[PDB]
Design a protein around this ligand. Sequence first.
Ligand SMILES: Nc1nc2c(ncn2[C@@H]2O[C@H](COP(=O)(O)OP(=O)(O)NP(=O)(O)O)[C@@H](O)[C@H]2O)c(=O)[nH]1
Ligand SMILES: [Mg+2]
Lengths: 64, 167
Amino acid sequence: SNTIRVLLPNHERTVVKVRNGMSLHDSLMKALKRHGLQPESSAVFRLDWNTDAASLIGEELQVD
Amino acid sequence: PMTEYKLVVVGAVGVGKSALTIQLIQNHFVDEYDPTIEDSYRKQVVIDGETCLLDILDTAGQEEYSAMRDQYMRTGEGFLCVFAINNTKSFEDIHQYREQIKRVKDSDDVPMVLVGNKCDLAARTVESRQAQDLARSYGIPYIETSAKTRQGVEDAFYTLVREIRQH
Ligand SMILES: Nc1nc2c(ncn2[C@@H]2O[C@H](COP(=O)(O)OP(=O)(O)NP(=O)(O)O)[C@@H](O)[C@H]2O)c(=O)[nH]1
Ligand SMILES: [Mg+2]
C-alpha cells in the first residue's frame, strides 16, 4: 500500500501518502502545518526525520 | 459536565470538506487545493452554555473512500453532508452518501445536516430551493456555508451537534 497512517496529540490523527524514496519530514510536512504543528517542535515516537517514508509503510507512529 | 460528540464530514472530491474544517479550527482559509485522505481534529467549544468536546473527521472521495467508507460511518454519530454549489455532480451524489449511511446505521433517522458550501461565488449551478426540498425529504436542516468568508460555518457545525443532542 502507498498509504501511511499517523497519530497526533489531543486524540488527533492524519493519513499521508508516500512515494519511492521520500523523506519522513518532507512527506508529511503539509499535514503537520495543516493540523497546526511544526516539525522542529514535533517529536516522532522513536525515529529520525531523515528516515525513508516508503520504508515505514504498514506501521503507525505517534507525534508529540 | 463534559459531553463528547463525534462528527464526520462526507462529500465529493472537491467541495471544501477540509476548507470548512480548517476554517472552524484554525480560523484560516487555505487557497491551495490539497486532497485529504483521512484527518481527525479535536476542539472544545461552548454550545448553548454546555462545554462540548468535538471530534471531526475529514473523509476522502473516489476509490479511497469507496472501500473504507463503511468503517467510519459506524463510528461517527453525526454526519455533515457537504456539497458545493458550483458543481452539480456533487449535489447529485448526496443521495448516494445518505443511502450508505442509513444502510450502515440501519436506521432512517440519523443526525445529518445538508450543507451547500462555496456560497461566496456568483453563478451558482444549484439553486437554494433545490437543496431545501432535498433536506426536507430527509428531515434534516439546510445551511449555506462559505469556508472562505466563514459565512454560517459556525452555524453549520453547531446545528449538527444540536441534531445529535436533541436526537
Ligand atoms: N470560494 C470558495 N472556495 C472554496 C470554498 N471551500 C473550498 N473552496 C475551494 O475549493 C478548494 C478545494 O477545497 P477542499 O477543502 O480541498 O475540498 P474537499 O471537499 O475537502 N476535498 P478533499 O477532502 O479531497 O481535500 C479549495 O482549495 C478552495 O480553492 C468556499 O467556501 N468558498
Ligand atoms: Mg479535504
